């Protein structure tokens, strides 16, 4: 990985914090002749354990193996000086879940579907690279000023450990139940096909402008509903093709789910023939307004 000297990094504002470090927006100056570029910077505070160092630098190591438009790009690391830092491109619109909730109703259906195609292309790349995400969710997608959505949050075990949506289960594992495929919940089987289930949940998150999956149902009630065969209902204003696709992501039998290649192909064809998105799935209303 590229080693960046600390004098090249200016931390400007905290944008995220945890117990063992923070995420900042800042600037990176590589050379005398080129203007500084905005970056995100994540630190690791003094006293970190061996495991913390391995996990922290391991996220950078994984990210440095990837080169794809829809995967967060690493600028480099500070490892020769303390505090250690990871420096990435700066995604101006932040996390997709919060972005959607703050921009409710502001996009066209075609823009929303384009977000999904970008996420799907990043996931196809990760799956092809033999990288299983385990925590695919709108909160772990970042959005730039071109509306490009990039997958983020990498690592072997730090990902689920660090995410407060991942909760301890009766069996002892820590997982984000509402996003996780049944085989991953039941027996800890995380594969690219469990990431496909999660992708279907992200599709529902995007098309609802960031609604919370399953609304107020508890984690146990979500699992019971999925095992009973229930699935999330159609969002309002959702293209039929898009709801069909998310429902195929949620097949109980892992082998019946589409692969990411199939998802990318379908989304790209829908976008290329955008009238295809004008046919909407029926929406089931919770409330009846009657007027004479
Ligand atoms: C987490 C929420 C978030 C994210 C970002 N942009 C980011 N871009 C890259 C980030 C990052 O975390 N990079 C990263 C680093 C630095 C190290 C390891 C892994 C990763 Cl993925 S965070 C920017 C903001 C932010 O403060 N403001 C924007 C403007 C105000 N409204 C929200 C978006 C908020």
PDB file of C-alpha atoms and ligand atoms in Angstrom:
ATOM      1  CA  UNK A   1       0.000   0.000   0.000  1.00  0.00           C
ATOM      2  CA  UNK A   2       1.057   3.598  -0.585  1.00  0.00           C
ATOM      3  CA  UNK A   3       2.630   5.085   2.545  1.00  0.00           C
ATOM      4  CA  UNK A   4       1.668   8.762   3.022  1.00  0.00           C
ATOM      5  CA  UNK A   5       3.740  11.105   5.141  1.00  0.00           C
ATOM      6  CA  UNK A   6       1.760  12.773   7.980  1.00  0.00           C
ATOM      7  CA  UNK A   7       2.765  16.262   6.804  1.00  0.00           C
ATOM      8  CA  UNK A   8       0.643  15.655   3.692  1.00  0.00           C
ATOM      9  CA  UNK A   9      -2.579  15.132   5.720  1.00  0.00           C
ATOM     10  CA  UNK A  10      -4.711  17.869   7.291  1.00  0.00           C
ATOM     11  CA  UNK A  11      -7.643  16.659   9.413  1.00  0.00           C
ATOM     12  CA  UNK A  12     -10.391  19.319   9.271  1.00  0.00           C
ATOM     13  CA  UNK A  13     -13.621  18.014  10.823  1.00  0.00           C
ATOM     14  CA  UNK A  14     -14.790  14.924  12.669  1.00  0.00           C
ATOM     15  CA  UNK A  15     -17.437  13.102  10.643  1.00  0.00           C
ATOM     16  CA  UNK A  16     -17.540   9.846  12.582  1.00  0.00           C
ATOM     17  CA  UNK A  17     -16.275   8.667  15.888  1.00  0.00           C
ATOM     18  CA  UNK A  18     -15.723   5.510  17.844  1.00  0.00           C
ATOM     19  CA  UNK A  19     -13.913   4.552  21.002  1.00  0.00           C
ATOM     20  CA  UNK A  20     -10.624   3.678  19.279  1.00  0.00           C
ATOM     21  CA  UNK A  21     -10.381   6.379  16.627  1.00  0.00           C
ATOM     22  CA  UNK A  22     -12.313   8.810  14.510  1.00  0.00           C
ATOM     23  CA  UNK A  23     -13.165   9.446  10.880  1.00  0.00           C
ATOM     24  CA  UNK A  24     -12.349  12.942   9.618  1.00  0.00           C
ATOM     25  CA  UNK A  25     -12.875  14.924   6.487  1.00  0.00           C
ATOM     26  CA  UNK A  26      -9.600  16.483   5.486  1.00  0.00           C
ATOM     27  CA  UNK A  27      -7.175  17.328   2.711  1.00  0.00           C
ATOM     28  CA  UNK A  28      -4.257  15.437   1.150  1.00  0.00           C
ATOM     29  CA  UNK A  29      -1.306  17.247  -0.483  1.00  0.00           C
ATOM     30  CA  UNK A  30       0.877  14.771  -2.373  1.00  0.00           C
ATOM     31  CA  UNK A  31       3.163  17.060  -4.417  1.00  0.00           C
ATOM     32  CA  UNK A  32       4.188  20.699  -4.511  1.00  0.00           C
ATOM     33  CA  UNK A  33       2.634  21.330  -7.915  1.00  0.00           C
ATOM     34  CA  UNK A  34      -0.810  19.772  -7.500  1.00  0.00           C
ATOM     35  CA  UNK A  35      -3.659  21.209  -5.452  1.00  0.00           C
ATOM     36  CA  UNK A  36      -4.770  19.430  -2.278  1.00  0.00           C
ATOM     37  CA  UNK A  37      -7.593  16.913  -2.714  1.00  0.00           C
ATOM     38  CA  UNK A  38     -10.370  16.228  -0.187  1.00  0.00           C
ATOM     39  CA  UNK A  39     -10.057  12.887   1.629  1.00  0.00           C
ATOM     40  CA  UNK A  40     -11.562  10.908   4.453  1.00  0.00           C
ATOM     41  CA  UNK A  41      -9.123   9.915   7.176  1.00  0.00           C
ATOM     42  CA  UNK A  42      -9.613   7.203   9.804  1.00  0.00           C
ATOM     43  CA  UNK A  43      -7.314   7.013  12.838  1.00  0.00           C
ATOM     44  CA  UNK A  44      -6.298   4.343  15.332  1.00  0.00           C
ATOM     45  CA  UNK A  45      -5.552   5.691  18.836  1.00  0.00           C
ATOM     46  CA  UNK A  46      -2.500   4.818  20.937  1.00  0.00           C
ATOM     47  CA  UNK A  47      -2.647   1.674  23.017  1.00  0.00           C
ATOM     48  CA  UNK A  48      -4.308  -0.340  20.270  1.00  0.00           C
ATOM     49  CA  UNK A  49      -4.003  -4.069  20.616  1.00  0.00           C
ATOM     50  CA  UNK A  50      -2.383  -6.450  18.144  1.00  0.00           C
ATOM     51  CA  UNK A  51      -5.846  -7.551  16.963  1.00  0.00           C
ATOM     52  CA  UNK A  52      -6.894  -3.933  16.508  1.00  0.00           C
ATOM     53  CA  UNK A  53      -3.799  -3.208  14.417  1.00  0.00           C
ATOM     54  CA  UNK A  54      -4.287  -6.311  12.290  1.00  0.00           C
ATOM     55  CA  UNK A  55      -7.967  -5.454  11.728  1.00  0.00           C
ATOM     56  CA  UNK A  56      -7.313  -1.748  11.070  1.00  0.00           C
ATOM     57  CA  UNK A  57      -4.488  -2.152   8.591  1.00  0.00           C
ATOM     58  CA  UNK A  58      -6.253  -5.219   7.228  1.00  0.00           C
ATOM     59  CA  UNK A  59      -9.153  -3.063   6.025  1.00  0.00           C
ATOM     60  CA  UNK A  60      -6.659  -0.934   4.124  1.00  0.00           C
ATOM     61  CA  UNK A  61      -4.942  -4.031   2.759  1.00  0.00           C
ATOM     62  CA  UNK A  62      -8.230  -5.408   1.411  1.00  0.00           C
ATOM     63  CA  UNK A  63      -9.231  -2.067  -0.094  1.00  0.00           C
ATOM     64  CA  UNK A  64      -5.822  -1.763  -1.777  1.00  0.00           C
ATOM     65  CA  UNK A  65      -6.456  -5.009  -3.633  1.00  0.00           C
ATOM     66  CA  UNK A  66      -9.546  -3.528  -5.337  1.00  0.00           C
ATOM     67  CA  UNK A  67      -9.829  -1.202  -8.338  1.00  0.00           C
ATOM     68  CA  UNK A  68     -13.452  -0.586  -9.266  1.00  0.00           C
ATOM     69  CA  UNK A  69     -15.656   2.493  -9.778  1.00  0.00           C
ATOM     70  CA  UNK A  70     -18.187   1.231  -7.209  1.00  0.00           C
ATOM     71  CA  UNK A  71     -15.687   0.324  -4.457  1.00  0.00           C
ATOM     72  CA  UNK A  72     -14.235   2.988  -2.140  1.00  0.00           C
ATOM     73  CA  UNK A  73     -10.731   3.903  -3.310  1.00  0.00           C
ATOM     74  CA  UNK A  74      -7.726   3.892  -0.954  1.00  0.00           C
ATOM     75  CA  UNK A  75      -5.286   6.802  -1.175  1.00  0.00           C
ATOM     76  CA  UNK A  76      -2.848   5.237   1.264  1.00  0.00           C
ATOM     77  CA  UNK A  77      -1.914   4.728   4.894  1.00  0.00           C
ATOM     78  CA  UNK A  78       0.173   6.245   7.636  1.00  0.00           C
ATOM     79  CA  UNK A  79       1.770   3.205   9.279  1.00  0.00           C
ATOM     80  CA  UNK A  80       5.370   4.409   9.964  1.00  0.00           C
ATOM     81  CA  UNK A  81       4.211   7.125  12.378  1.00  0.00           C
ATOM     82  CA  UNK A  82       1.625   7.300  15.144  1.00  0.00           C
ATOM     83  CA  UNK A  83      -1.275   7.702  15.146  1.00  0.00           C
ATOM     84  CA  UNK A  84      -1.799   5.378  12.247  1.00  0.00           C
ATOM     85  CA  UNK A  85      -4.279   6.467   9.606  1.00  0.00           C
ATOM     86  CA  UNK A  86      -6.139   5.184   6.576  1.00  0.00           C
ATOM     87  CA  UNK A  87      -6.837   7.746   3.839  1.00  0.00           C
ATOM     88  CA  UNK A  88      -9.527   7.269   1.193  1.00  0.00           C
ATOM     89  CA  UNK A  89     -11.392   9.302  -1.341  1.00  0.00           C
ATOM     90  CA  UNK A  90     -13.996  11.587   0.248  1.00  0.00           C
ATOM     91  CA  UNK A  91     -17.628  10.772  -0.559  1.00  0.00           C
ATOM     92  CA  UNK A  92     -19.386  14.115  -0.285  1.00  0.00           C
ATOM     93  CA  UNK A  93     -22.934  12.817   0.355  1.00  0.00           C
ATOM     94  CA  UNK A  94     -22.025  10.345   3.103  1.00  0.00           C
ATOM     95  CA  UNK A  95     -23.818   7.127   3.931  1.00  0.00           C
ATOM     96  CA  UNK A  96     -26.639   6.088   1.601  1.00  0.00           C
ATOM     97  CA  UNK A  97     -29.191   5.301   4.351  1.00  0.00           C
ATOM     98  CA  UNK A  98     -29.005   8.765   5.902  1.00  0.00           C
ATOM     99  CA  UNK A  99     -28.745  10.410   2.476  1.00  0.00           C
ATOM    100  CA  UNK A 100     -31.984   8.839   1.265  1.00  0.00           C
ATOM    101  CA  UNK A 101     -33.834   9.719   4.475  1.00  0.00           C
ATOM    102  CA  UNK A 102     -32.700  13.325   4.151  1.00  0.00           C
ATOM    103  CA  UNK A 103     -33.693  13.536   0.450  1.00  0.00           C
ATOM    104  CA  UNK A 104     -37.076  11.827   0.583  1.00  0.00           C
ATOM    105  CA  UNK A 105     -38.836  11.917  -2.776  1.00  0.00           C
ATOM    106  CA  UNK A 106     -36.136  14.015  -4.498  1.00  0.00           C
ATOM    107  CA  UNK A 107     -34.947  11.547  -7.160  1.00  0.00           C
ATOM    108  CA  UNK A 108     -36.419   9.970 -10.226  1.00  0.00           C
ATOM    109  CA  UNK A 109     -37.040   6.246 -10.344  1.00  0.00           C
ATOM    110  CA  UNK A 110     -34.329   6.044 -12.990  1.00  0.00           C
ATOM    111  CA  UNK A 111     -31.837   7.704 -10.616  1.00  0.00           C
ATOM    112  CA  UNK A 112     -32.749   5.276  -7.815  1.00  0.00           C
ATOM    113  CA  UNK A 113     -32.314   2.285 -10.132  1.00  0.00           C
ATOM    114  CA  UNK A 114     -28.970   3.693 -11.268  1.00  0.00           C
ATOM    115  CA  UNK A 115     -27.819   3.697  -7.645  1.00  0.00           C
ATOM    116  CA  UNK A 116     -28.745   0.038  -7.411  1.00  0.00           C
ATOM    117  CA  UNK A 117     -26.895  -0.805 -10.615  1.00  0.00           C
ATOM    118  CA  UNK A 118     -23.730   0.797  -9.225  1.00  0.00           C
ATOM    119  CA  UNK A 119     -23.998  -1.103  -5.950  1.00  0.00           C
ATOM    120  CA  UNK A 120     -24.655  -4.336  -7.879  1.00  0.00           C
ATOM    121  CA  UNK A 121     -21.579  -3.754 -10.081  1.00  0.00           C
ATOM    122  CA  UNK A 122     -19.411  -3.242  -7.023  1.00  0.00           C
ATOM    123  CA  UNK A 123     -20.835  -6.413  -5.450  1.00  0.00           C
ATOM    124  CA  UNK A 124     -20.314  -8.419  -8.655  1.00  0.00           C
ATOM    125  CA  UNK A 125     -16.680  -7.331  -8.564  1.00  0.00           C
ATOM    126  CA  UNK A 126     -16.293  -8.281  -4.874  1.00  0.00           C
ATOM    127  CA  UNK A 127     -17.964 -11.670  -5.339  1.00  0.00           C
ATOM    128  CA  UNK A 128     -15.763 -12.390  -8.390  1.00  0.00           C
ATOM    129  CA  UNK A 129     -12.715 -11.431  -6.305  1.00  0.00           C
ATOM    130  CA  UNK A 130     -13.895 -14.027  -3.713  1.00  0.00           C
ATOM    131  CA  UNK A 131     -14.702 -11.347  -1.124  1.00  0.00           C
ATOM    132  CA  UNK A 132     -17.854 -11.931   0.975  1.00  0.00           C
ATOM    133  CA  UNK A 133     -19.050  -8.684   2.507  1.00  0.00           C
ATOM    134  CA  UNK A 134     -21.357  -9.994   5.303  1.00  0.00           C
ATOM    135  CA  UNK A 135     -22.726  -6.525   6.112  1.00  0.00           C
ATOM    136  CA  UNK A 136     -24.195  -5.207   2.853  1.00  0.00           C
ATOM    137  CA  UNK A 137     -26.731  -2.513   3.820  1.00  0.00           C
ATOM    138  CA  UNK A 138     -27.388   1.095   2.811  1.00  0.00           C
ATOM    139  CA  UNK A 139     -25.531   2.276   5.928  1.00  0.00           C
ATOM    140  CA  UNK A 140     -22.348   0.736   4.418  1.00  0.00           C
ATOM    141  CA  UNK A 141     -22.674   2.336   0.986  1.00  0.00           C
ATOM    142  CA  UNK A 142     -21.211   5.802   0.435  1.00  0.00           C
ATOM    143  CA  UNK A 143     -22.443   8.394  -2.110  1.00  0.00           C
ATOM    144  CA  UNK A 144     -20.433  11.012  -4.013  1.00  0.00           C
ATOM    145  CA  UNK A 145     -21.413  14.289  -5.745  1.00  0.00           C
ATOM    146  CA  UNK A 146     -22.062  12.389  -8.976  1.00  0.00           C
ATOM    147  CA  UNK A 147     -24.629  10.178  -7.180  1.00  0.00           C
ATOM    148  CA  UNK A 148     -22.232   7.241  -7.539  1.00  0.00           C
ATOM    149  CA  UNK A 149     -22.734   4.631  -4.845  1.00  0.00           C
ATOM    150  CA  UNK A 150     -19.672   2.743  -3.604  1.00  0.00           C
ATOM    151  CA  UNK A 151     -19.460  -0.271  -1.352  1.00  0.00           C
ATOM    152  CA  UNK A 152     -17.467   0.304   1.829  1.00  0.00           C
ATOM    153  CA  UNK A 153     -16.695  -1.320   5.204  1.00  0.00           C
ATOM    154  CA  UNK A 154     -14.189  -4.094   4.655  1.00  0.00           C
ATOM    155  CA  UNK A 155     -12.444  -6.629   6.863  1.00  0.00           C
ATOM    156  CA  UNK A 156     -12.596 -10.210   8.014  1.00  0.00           C
ATOM    157  CA  UNK A 157     -14.219  -9.842  11.444  1.00  0.00           C
ATOM    158  CA  UNK A 158     -14.076  -6.161  12.367  1.00  0.00           C
ATOM    159  CA  UNK A 159     -17.056  -5.434  10.081  1.00  0.00           C
ATOM    160  CA  UNK A 160     -19.724  -7.158  12.136  1.00  0.00           C
ATOM    161  CA  UNK A 161     -17.944  -6.392  15.415  1.00  0.00           C
ATOM    162  CA  UNK A 162     -17.971  -2.636  14.734  1.00  0.00           C
ATOM    163  CA  UNK A 163     -21.543  -2.287  13.373  1.00  0.00           C
ATOM    164  CA  UNK A 164     -24.088  -1.535  16.160  1.00  0.00           C
ATOM    165  CA  UNK A 165     -26.870  -2.919  13.943  1.00  0.00           C
ATOM    166  CA  UNK A 166     -25.193  -6.317  14.271  1.00  0.00           C
ATOM    167  CA  UNK A 167     -26.589  -7.797  17.479  1.00  0.00           C
ATOM    168  CA  UNK A 168     -25.696 -10.823  19.554  1.00  0.00           C
ATOM    169  CA  UNK A 169     -27.953 -13.750  18.752  1.00  0.00           C
ATOM    170  CA  UNK A 170     -29.125 -16.637  20.893  1.00  0.00           C
ATOM    171  CA  UNK A 171     -26.443 -18.761  19.163  1.00  0.00           C
ATOM    172  CA  UNK A 172     -23.645 -16.310  20.051  1.00  0.00           C
ATOM    173  CA  UNK A 173     -22.881 -14.723  16.669  1.00  0.00           C
ATOM    174  CA  UNK A 174     -23.196 -10.970  16.066  1.00  0.00           C
ATOM    175  CA  UNK A 175     -25.182 -10.216  12.906  1.00  0.00           C
ATOM    176  CA  UNK A 176     -27.515  -7.536  11.476  1.00  0.00           C
ATOM    177  CA  UNK A 177     -30.564  -9.703  11.485  1.00  0.00           C
ATOM    178  CA  UNK A 178     -32.858  -7.685   9.141  1.00  0.00           C
ATOM    179  CA  UNK A 179     -30.213  -7.676   6.406  1.00  0.00           C
ATOM    180  CA  UNK A 180     -28.946 -11.254   6.785  1.00  0.00           C
ATOM    181  CA  UNK A 181     -29.844 -14.342   4.790  1.00  0.00           C
ATOM    182  CA  UNK A 182     -31.451 -17.270   6.663  1.00  0.00           C
ATOM    183  CA  UNK A 183     -28.478 -19.621   6.288  1.00  0.00           C
ATOM    184  CA  UNK A 184     -26.166 -16.973   7.717  1.00  0.00           C
ATOM    185  CA  UNK A 185     -28.475 -16.453  10.699  1.00  0.00           C
ATOM    186  CA  UNK A 186     -29.089 -20.143  11.275  1.00  0.00           C
ATOM    187  CA  UNK A 187     -25.660 -21.686  10.744  1.00  0.00           C
ATOM    188  CA  UNK A 188     -23.163 -18.906  10.056  1.00  0.00           C
ATOM    189  CA  UNK A 189     -22.970 -19.611   6.297  1.00  0.00           C
ATOM    190  CA  UNK A 190     -21.859 -16.311   4.703  1.00  0.00           C
ATOM    191  CA  UNK A 191     -21.310 -16.428   0.952  1.00  0.00           C
ATOM    192  CA  UNK A 192     -21.855 -14.208  -2.026  1.00  0.00           C
ATOM    193  CA  UNK A 193     -25.374 -15.673  -2.136  1.00  0.00           C
ATOM    194  CA  UNK A 194     -26.076 -14.392   1.365  1.00  0.00           C
ATOM    195  CA  UNK A 195     -24.770 -11.044   0.118  1.00  0.00           C
ATOM    196  CA  UNK A 196     -27.393 -11.321  -2.668  1.00  0.00           C
ATOM    197  CA  UNK A 197     -30.138 -11.587  -0.013  1.00  0.00           C
ATOM    198  CA  UNK A 198     -28.694  -8.473   1.610  1.00  0.00           C
ATOM    199  CA  UNK A 199     -28.646  -6.745  -1.775  1.00  0.00           C
ATOM    200  CA  UNK A 200     -32.366  -7.366  -2.093  1.00  0.00           C
ATOM    201  CA  UNK A 201     -32.817  -5.611   1.258  1.00  0.00           C
ATOM    202  CA  UNK A 202     -30.691  -2.698  -0.018  1.00  0.00           C
ATOM    203  CA  UNK A 203     -32.945  -2.521  -3.103  1.00  0.00           C
ATOM    204  CA  UNK A 204     -35.908  -2.107  -0.744  1.00  0.00           C
ATOM    205  CA  UNK A 205     -34.019   0.495   1.288  1.00  0.00           C
ATOM    206  CA  UNK A 206     -33.293   2.542  -1.850  1.00  0.00           C
ATOM    207  CA  UNK A 207     -36.796   2.351  -3.316  1.00  0.00           C
ATOM    208  CA  UNK A 208     -38.339   3.411   0.038  1.00  0.00           C
ATOM    209  CA  UNK A 209     -35.890   6.292   0.635  1.00  0.00           C
ATOM    210  CA  UNK A 210     -34.363   4.541   3.599  1.00  0.00           C
ATOM    211  CA  UNK A 211     -37.228   2.992   5.463  1.00  0.00           C
ATOM    212  CA  UNK A 212     -36.213   0.612   8.199  1.00  0.00           C
ATOM    213  CA  UNK A 213     -36.697  -2.972   6.926  1.00  0.00           C
ATOM    214  CA  UNK A 214     -39.630  -4.717   8.622  1.00  0.00           C
ATOM    215  CA  UNK A 215     -40.449  -1.404  10.439  1.00  0.00           C
ATOM    216  CA  UNK A 216     -40.893  -2.043  14.194  1.00  0.00           C
ATOM    217  CA  UNK A 217     -40.852  -5.864  14.123  1.00  0.00           C
ATOM    218  CA  UNK A 218     -38.292  -7.161  16.598  1.00  0.00           C
ATOM    219  CA  UNK A 219     -35.340  -9.250  15.433  1.00  0.00           C
ATOM    220  CA  UNK A 220     -37.061 -12.456  16.573  1.00  0.00           C
ATOM    221  CA  UNK A 221     -40.263 -11.483  14.838  1.00  0.00           C
ATOM    222  CA  UNK A 222     -38.326 -10.801  11.573  1.00  0.00           C
ATOM    223  CA  UNK A 223     -36.805 -14.233  11.674  1.00  0.00           C
ATOM    224  CA  UNK A 224     -40.170 -15.854  12.381  1.00  0.00           C
ATOM    225  CA  UNK A 225     -41.805 -14.000   9.524  1.00  0.00           C
ATOM    226  CA  UNK A 226     -39.076 -14.962   7.035  1.00  0.00           C
ATOM    227  CA  UNK A 227     -39.223 -18.595   8.133  1.00  0.00           C
ATOM    228  CA  UNK A 228     -43.052 -18.491   7.801  1.00  0.00           C
ATOM    229  CA  UNK A 229     -42.541 -17.293   4.162  1.00  0.00           C
ATOM    230  CA  UNK A 230     -43.453 -13.605   4.574  1.00  0.00           C
ATOM    231  CA  UNK A 231     -41.372 -11.042   2.661  1.00  0.00           C
ATOM    232  CA  UNK A 232     -41.174  -7.249   2.632  1.00  0.00           C
ATOM    233  CA  UNK A 233     -44.100  -5.743   0.674  1.00  0.00           C
ATOM    234  CA  UNK A 234     -43.668  -3.622  -2.389  1.00  0.00           C
ATOM    235  CA  UNK A 235     -42.485  -0.041  -1.853  1.00  0.00           C
ATOM    236  CA  UNK A 236     -44.707   2.763  -3.136  1.00  0.00           C
ATOM    237  CA  UNK A 237     -43.921   3.803  -6.691  1.00  0.00           C
ATOM    238  CA  UNK A 238     -41.796   0.726  -7.339  1.00  0.00           C
ATOM    239  CA  UNK A 239     -41.233  -0.663 -10.831  1.00  0.00           C
ATOM    240  CA  UNK A 240     -42.632  -4.181 -11.112  1.00  0.00           C
ATOM    241  CA  UNK A 241     -39.337  -5.451 -12.523  1.00  0.00           C
ATOM    242  CA  UNK A 242     -37.462  -4.089  -9.500  1.00  0.00           C
ATOM    243  CA  UNK A 243     -39.819  -5.718  -6.988  1.00  0.00           C
ATOM    244  CA  UNK A 244     -39.632  -8.986  -8.924  1.00  0.00           C
ATOM    245  CA  UNK A 245     -35.840  -8.839  -8.701  1.00  0.00           C
ATOM    246  CA  UNK A 246     -35.702  -8.132  -4.968  1.00  0.00           C
ATOM    247  CA  UNK A 247     -38.114 -11.017  -4.323  1.00  0.00           C
ATOM    248  CA  UNK A 248     -35.804 -13.386  -6.185  1.00  0.00           C
ATOM    249  CA  UNK A 249     -32.941 -12.232  -3.979  1.00  0.00           C
ATOM    250  CA  UNK A 250     -35.008 -13.443  -0.998  1.00  0.00           C
ATOM    251  CA  UNK A 251     -35.433 -17.059  -2.002  1.00  0.00           C
ATOM    252  CA  UNK A 252     -35.015 -19.305   1.032  1.00  0.00           C
ATOM    253  CA  UNK A 253     -33.012 -21.774  -1.042  1.00  0.00           C
ATOM    254  CA  UNK A 254     -29.615 -20.164  -1.616  1.00  0.00           C
ATOM    255  CA  UNK A 255     -29.084 -21.936  -4.945  1.00  0.00           C
ATOM    256  CA  UNK A 256     -32.246 -20.337  -6.444  1.00  0.00           C
ATOM    257  CA  UNK A 257     -31.072 -16.721  -5.905  1.00  0.00           C
ATOM    258  CA  UNK A 258     -29.637 -14.773  -8.830  1.00  0.00           C
ATOM    259  CA  UNK A 259     -25.891 -14.284  -8.966  1.00  0.00           C
ATOM    260  CA  UNK A 260     -24.589 -10.720  -8.965  1.00  0.00           C
ATOM    261  CA  UNK A 261     -23.865 -11.121 -12.688  1.00  0.00           C
ATOM    262  CA  UNK A 262     -27.549 -11.737 -13.271  1.00  0.00           C
ATOM    263  CA  UNK A 263     -28.536  -8.738 -11.158  1.00  0.00           C
ATOM    264  CA  UNK A 264     -26.134  -6.385 -12.987  1.00  0.00           C
ATOM    265  CA  UNK A 265     -27.362  -7.613 -16.352  1.00  0.00           C
ATOM    266  CA  UNK A 266     -31.026  -7.075 -15.533  1.00  0.00           C
ATOM    267  CA  UNK A 267     -30.473  -3.633 -14.007  1.00  0.00           C
ATOM    268  CA  UNK A 268     -28.384  -2.510 -16.948  1.00  0.00           C
ATOM    269  CA  UNK A 269     -31.075  -3.613 -19.413  1.00  0.00           C
ATOM    270  CA  UNK A 270     -33.826  -1.851 -17.451  1.00  0.00           C
ATOM    271  CA  UNK A 271     -31.808   1.373 -17.395  1.00  0.00           C
ATOM    272  CA  UNK A 272     -31.006   1.136 -21.101  1.00  0.00           C
ATOM    273  CA  UNK A 273     -34.743   0.768 -21.875  1.00  0.00           C
ATOM    274  CA  UNK A 274     -36.013   3.169 -19.190  1.00  0.00           C
ATOM    275  CA  UNK A 275     -39.696   2.941 -20.167  1.00  0.00           C
ATOM    276  CA  UNK A 276     -39.461  -0.582 -18.676  1.00  0.00           C
ATOM    277  CA  UNK A 277     -39.447   1.097 -15.246  1.00  0.00           C
ATOM    278  CA  UNK A 278     -42.781   2.834 -15.847  1.00  0.00           C
ATOM    279  CA  UNK A 279     -44.791  -0.335 -15.123  1.00  0.00           C
ATOM    280  CA  UNK A 280     -45.293  -0.315 -11.354  1.00  0.00           C
ATOM    281  CA  UNK A 281     -46.014  -3.112  -8.946  1.00  0.00           C
ATOM    282  CA  UNK A 282     -49.313  -2.743  -7.046  1.00  0.00           C
ATOM    283  CA  UNK A 283     -48.899  -1.170  -3.591  1.00  0.00           C
ATOM    284  CA  UNK A 284     -50.969  -2.513  -0.650  1.00  0.00           C
ATOM    285  CA  UNK A 285     -52.332   0.501   1.279  1.00  0.00           C
ATOM    286  CA  UNK A 286     -52.418   0.377   5.057  1.00  0.00           C
ATOM    287  CA  UNK A 287     -54.975   3.172   5.258  1.00  0.00           C
ATOM    288  CA  UNK A 288     -58.226   3.821   3.406  1.00  0.00           C
ATOM    289  CA  UNK A 289     -59.282   7.413   2.638  1.00  0.00           C
ATOM    290  CA  UNK A 290     -62.886   7.555   1.411  1.00  0.00           C
ATOM    291  CA  UNK A 291     -64.623  10.686   0.220  1.00  0.00           C
ATOM    292  CA  UNK A 292     -68.175  11.032  -1.165  1.00  0.00           C
TER     293      UNK A 292
HETATM  294  C1  LIG B   1     -20.198   8.253   7.612  1.00  0.00           C
HETATM  295  C2  LIG B   1     -21.057   9.397   7.091  1.00  0.00           C
HETATM  296  C3  LIG B   1     -20.383  10.331   6.296  1.00  0.00           C
HETATM  297  C4  LIG B   1     -19.476   9.947   5.315  1.00  0.00           C
HETATM  298  C5  LIG B   1     -18.806  10.880   4.548  1.00  0.00           C
HETATM  299  N1  LIG B   1     -17.940  10.545   3.587  1.00  0.00           N
HETATM  300  C6  LIG B   1     -17.021   9.571   3.709  1.00  0.00           C
HETATM  301  N2  LIG B   1     -16.194   9.300   2.693  1.00  0.00           N
HETATM  302  C7  LIG B   1     -15.330   8.299   3.004  1.00  0.00           C
HETATM  303  C8  LIG B   1     -15.407   7.759   4.261  1.00  0.00           C
HETATM  304  C9  LIG B   1     -14.681   6.712   4.865  1.00  0.00           C
HETATM  305  O1  LIG B   1     -15.121   6.234   5.919  1.00  0.00           O
HETATM  306  N3  LIG B   1     -13.533   6.228   4.296  1.00  0.00           N
HETATM  307  C10 LIG B   1     -12.837   5.179   4.903  1.00  0.00           C
HETATM  308  C11 LIG B   1     -11.614   5.424   5.557  1.00  0.00           C
HETATM  309  C12 LIG B   1     -11.098   6.720   5.649  1.00  0.00           C
HETATM  310  C13 LIG B   1     -10.907   4.367   6.156  1.00  0.00           C
HETATM  311  C14 LIG B   1     -11.420   3.075   6.086  1.00  0.00           C
HETATM  312  C15 LIG B   1     -12.611   2.831   5.406  1.00  0.00           C
HETATM  313  C16 LIG B   1     -13.334   3.877   4.820  1.00  0.00           C
HETATM  314 CL1  LIG B   1     -14.821   3.539   3.955  1.00  0.00          CL
HETATM  315  S1  LIG B   1     -16.720   8.607   5.121  1.00  0.00           S
HETATM  316  C17 LIG B   1     -19.064  12.236   4.728  1.00  0.00           C
HETATM  317  C18 LIG B   1     -19.973  12.639   5.712  1.00  0.00           C
HETATM  318  C19 LIG B   1     -20.222  13.963   6.085  1.00  0.00           C
HETATM  319  O2  LIG B   1     -19.784  14.319   7.177  1.00  0.00           O
HETATM  320  N4  LIG B   1     -20.914  14.846   5.393  1.00  0.00           N
HETATM  321  C20 LIG B   1     -21.569  14.843   4.121  1.00  0.00           C
HETATM  322  C21 LIG B   1     -22.171  16.230   4.125  1.00  0.00           C
HETATM  323  C22 LIG B   1     -23.133  16.334   5.308  1.00  0.00           C
HETATM  324  N5  LIG B   1     -24.263  15.414   5.119  1.00  0.00           N
HETATM  325  C23 LIG B   1     -23.724  14.043   5.110  1.00  0.00           C
HETATM  326  C24 LIG B   1     -22.682  13.838   4.031  1.00  0.00           C
HETATM  327  C25 LIG B   1     -20.599  11.680   6.495  1.00  0.00           C
END
